[PDB]
Structures are given as structure tokens and as C-alpha cells.
Amino acid sequence: AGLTPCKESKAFAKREKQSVKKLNSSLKKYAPDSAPALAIQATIDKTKRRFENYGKFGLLCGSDGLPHLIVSGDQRHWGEFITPGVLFLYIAGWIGWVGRSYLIAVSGEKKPAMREIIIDVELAARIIPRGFIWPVAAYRELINGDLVVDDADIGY
């Protein structure tokens, strides 16, 4: 839709210029060696190299000088949604599966509430690292139908 990358646009350069300009104008109110002034210059070069990094990864860039994600599915601009999306999905599946497995395990006790408030940190530690199995394991579960239930609703 006409969004040029700010490796080439101008308003991005204007934003960068104004930001570093106000920062520099603020910088000249101390000693050129004072640790606060040093950190100020540090943040200056930091935001500068940020602008540089943004001007390195195909970031299509708005008509007002701002990045703008492209989540349309085209893997050309995928370093914004697709790969971080699947990464977070992996993490979330990790957490969900480990929690579910812990609960299913600890269900078999006298009053599982006492272990739901005060976790079996030993069992918790020997159950927790199983995350690397969450895609495949649950998979087999659904294959064997051991993931859901049919007509057991209350009680257990």
C-alpha cells in the first residue's frame, strides 16, 4: 500500500534528527565528563543504533515516520509475527502441558488440595522439564483419545 521502508523514507530521518537534537541540547548543561552526562550520551548513541537497526530489516515504514508491521502472511515480513508467534505458541504449550501433567499426576492423593496450595516441589522439579515433549506427547494422547472425556462431568 505504498509504505516505503525507512531505510529510504525521510520522516524517519526527521524523527531521528529531532530526538538526537533535543537529547544533545539537554546534554550541554553539565560537565562533559559527569557520569549523568556520560549516560545521556550513552542513551543518545543507543537510540541512534536503534534507528540504524530498524534501517536494516526491511521495516516498511509509515507516511508519518513510524514503523508499521506487515502481518498479512507473506513471510517476506515474518520477523514480526510468524516466527515470534510460533515461538510464543511453543512457550505457551510448554506451560499448559507441564501444568496439566502436574495436576493429573498429583490428583492421586488423599486431599489433592493440600498439594495444590503447597506444591510437591520435588515432583514439580521432576515433572517440569518435560516441556520438550508437549507437541508430540499430547499428540499421541489425542491419537489414543486419552486427552478428553465424553460423559464424566462432575466429581472428577
Partner 1 sequence: MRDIKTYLSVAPVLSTLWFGALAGLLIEINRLFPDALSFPFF
Partner 2 sequence: KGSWLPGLQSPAYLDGSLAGDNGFDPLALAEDPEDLRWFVQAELVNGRWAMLGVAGMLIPEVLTKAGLLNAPEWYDAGKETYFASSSTLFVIEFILFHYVEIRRWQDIKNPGSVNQDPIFKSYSLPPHECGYPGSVFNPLNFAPTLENKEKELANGRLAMLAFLGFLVQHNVTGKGPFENLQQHLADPWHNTIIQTI
Nearer to ligand CLA, 61 or 98 (CB): 98
| Candidate segments 6-14, 17-25, 54-62, 146-154, binder of partner 1 by CB under 8 A | 54-62
Task: Select the residue interacting with ligand CLA from 36, 79, 96, 135 (CB under 6 A).
Answer: 96
Alpha carbons 130 and 28: distance in angstroms, whole number: 55
The answer to whether the beta carbons of residues 70 and 60 sit under 8 Å apart is: yes
CA dist 139 and 132 (Å) reads 13
Quick one: CA torsion of 80, 85, 88, 90, rounded to 10 degrees? -140
Residue list 96-135, contact with partner 1 (CB under 8 A): 117-121
- Show me where the chain is broken: residue before each gap, C-N > 2.5 A: none
Query: Which of partner 1, partner 2, ligand CLA, none sits in contact with 140, Cβ below 5 to 8 A by type?
Result: partner 2
Q: Which of 40, 72, 53 is nearest to 5 (CA)?
A: 53
Give the residue with the Cβ less far from ligand CLA, 42 or 103.
103
* Piece of the chain touching ligand CLA by CB under 6 A; list 27-35, 42-50, 54-62, 66-74: 66-74
What residues line the site for partner 2 (CB under 8 A)?
Answer: 129-130, 132-133, 136-137, 140
Residues 6+ apart with CB under 8 A from 17: none
Residue type, 114: M
From 3-11, 29-37, 69-77, 147-155, give the range in contact with ligand CLA by CB under 6 A: 69-77
Among 72, 111, 145, 154, binds ligand CLA (CB under 6 A): 72
